[model samples]
Target: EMPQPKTFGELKNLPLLNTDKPVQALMKIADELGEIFKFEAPGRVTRYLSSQRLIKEACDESRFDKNLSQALKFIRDFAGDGLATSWTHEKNWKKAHNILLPSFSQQAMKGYHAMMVDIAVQLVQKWERLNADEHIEVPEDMTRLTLDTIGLCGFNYRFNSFYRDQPHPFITSMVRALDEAMNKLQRANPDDPAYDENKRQFQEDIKVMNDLVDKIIADRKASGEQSDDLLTHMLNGKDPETGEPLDDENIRYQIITFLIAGHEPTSGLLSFALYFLVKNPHVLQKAAEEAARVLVDPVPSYKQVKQLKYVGMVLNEALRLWPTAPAFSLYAKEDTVLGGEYPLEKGDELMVLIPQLHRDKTIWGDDVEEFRPERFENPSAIPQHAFKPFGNGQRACIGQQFALHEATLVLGMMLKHFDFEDHTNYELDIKETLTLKPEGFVVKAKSKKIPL
Candidate 1:
């Protein structure tokens, strides 16, 4: 007989599976249902795997492969065949993957260092101008910093988000599309109120995104200007193995992928890091001291970034507590029994909840809920697959190093220049769109030195 995991929810109790806060709901379910369990959602049964052992088994590509959730497929409506949304077998995924790898190299980071600093200082300069009574919106400014960094560094475009009161229109449209995708995934009725109107608006948002990205690509081609950046790479570079360059359509997809995939999660990371820092003054002090020591000249050098070890730990711990990307889906390549007990069929989909995996008591010890950065002091001891803020295996985030490099610089610089105070004593209420962030989280920044 085939082994069956415990199940929850049915058509009669469909409301159990429906919630605005799905990730938090999963945490409550895991506590009651144990690590591996199933929930029937309308026509389909979705299994969530949170145990370190089961997730370890799921990580084997020989048995399982990455599967796009319904939400990601919805995102594909606009971000067609982009790296983040493309299937592994798709030729464009491989072509774009290879072409963009060099842009993330250490040498490439050095090439982009000054561009990063220019944006980093732009943020610092903005904060320096704030009044003593000003309450800084953490996620909003972090979004500006990261979006501007990727803008200049990746495509040589400029969002210059800090100078304006509103974000660029591309960001506005992209957020709407992402928000609508999440809403579509959870709603059962296609004829629900505003459904058609929302779909119409969603299409309009897609057009807005496409028009802007197309313009960026067209202007770059017209300029005939070649520089060492991601745009230069995608337009000119080829797959070393296949010698195939990305076509213009795929190039447009790549640009959208980079902008959406590039900024949101890193912004969440910085925002969450600040939330944790204010709540734990000791951790904040230690991290700030490391920043002050390493970043003696206002901004850090590429070498100095690597030396921000404790600051990296705080980032790691923050991600551990709340992985901004949240979850990844995988499906069986063949018949398999997970954890040597629960039988899974040839194509059973399993969702690995990184937040739950990170909280596994067997791997993290009894004090797992506490905000402790020291746990990361010895990374190798944490066991393989126990900590994957970036997803697993070959399909893991290609921008992992780039995101970390950018985040370390921003966090280190923020700590060095200002002391963050959580004046509201704000509690974390994560807001979910395509990614996760602490909703309405704010802090007051007191600059260490007067602005020049």
Candidate 2:
């Protein structure tokens, strides 16, 4: 008889198998084993097969069952090809640091400072209108706000994504498509012919985004504009070795990817951070005190952002608890050992289940689930691979710094304007698509009396 799947080590050495089918099989076994042996799975499958199956099975058994099909489709389309290829070249981080870093650290910070002033002024006006002891609820959707900020800072265009009651159709569609692609890619079976259709759709979506980015690049190039925006810099950028202008596709890909990744993850982090703050008043009060001490005036400048160490820790803790990129999948190029026991051969795949890892008591200790920002006060205190909101090893998130700056800026400004309190009285129901987001986070924002 074939060896039954048992542990992470044993499962790591199993022969290659159909990705989705085996995951479904594993979950059935897990349910039978109850909570005692839920983590056990014997057989070494490809990294891709193992990771995809794990998530697919989890969703099928969870309340997220409604979103299972879309999620599966997303894994099939994006995770398998898009994400796998990205890791192979380490293209995600390479392009981010090289092409996008200066813009976020310098240019984006400048834009954020200016926008906060504008938002503060608007809040003041609204407070004046009410003339009541209530806080003016600033529309607090960081995803749209970041997109609008990116327009001014990166593209020199006005998306006004934050001003509208609903996000722009294009923005909404882009996120949905990306999420679906990730799910589809995760559940893909190498031998299954049905995957071709999903792949084609993924390609089509990429083309649509590519065409849109091309138009933006062409327009900027034609204008011959001399702006400090990202598009201008990218257009003028030349390969140091070749001394040739960066290819148009390369520029477009970088811009579009930055816009998508930058906005969504920051938004998710801010939302979760605020949720924790409201739930834990002491933490919120401490952050408020830190903000007051850090910002000399009502508005925070780029310099003020640098000084907010406690705020940064709060954001980091939030990311640790609620990573926007909740899970990631990897495929082996050749046979290798993983997690010390799994034998992965060429063409095998695996996934690092980030959420599980982040919440693991063994790694994070008994208080692992608690929201403690101070846990990160000393970087040396935590073990390697124990905390990976942006992933680990050579394939970690490239836009980590950029995202951090944006989240800090937003948190600083929002905390300055309003005191967030949970009004809906509903427990957070997180949805996992491209990023993790609360299905709906309704809160009451009270305007603060202090200007500093």
* The best candidate in terms of TM-score: 1
Q: lDDT scores for all predictions?
A: 0.84, 0.56
Best by lDDT: 1
User: Candidate 2, residues 265-327: lDDT per residue as tens digits?
Assistant: 667787788777787778888887887788767667777876777778888888877887765
Structural RMSD, model 2: 8.2
Off by over 4 Å in 1: 1-17, 189-194, 450-452
lDDT of 2 at 132: 43
RMSD of each: 2.3, 8.2
Candidate 1 lDDT score at position 9 = 40
* Cα lDDT tens digits for candidate 1, 1-452: 32223345445224554666678777777766777877566676557888898999889888888888767778888888888888877898888889888888889888777788888899888998898799888889988888888888888888889988788788899999988877776677867775988999899998898888877787787776667788889898999879989988898888988888888898889888888999999999999999999987756898898889998999999999888888888889899999988888988988888889889999999888888999999777788889888888878888888788888888989999999899999988998776778988999999998342
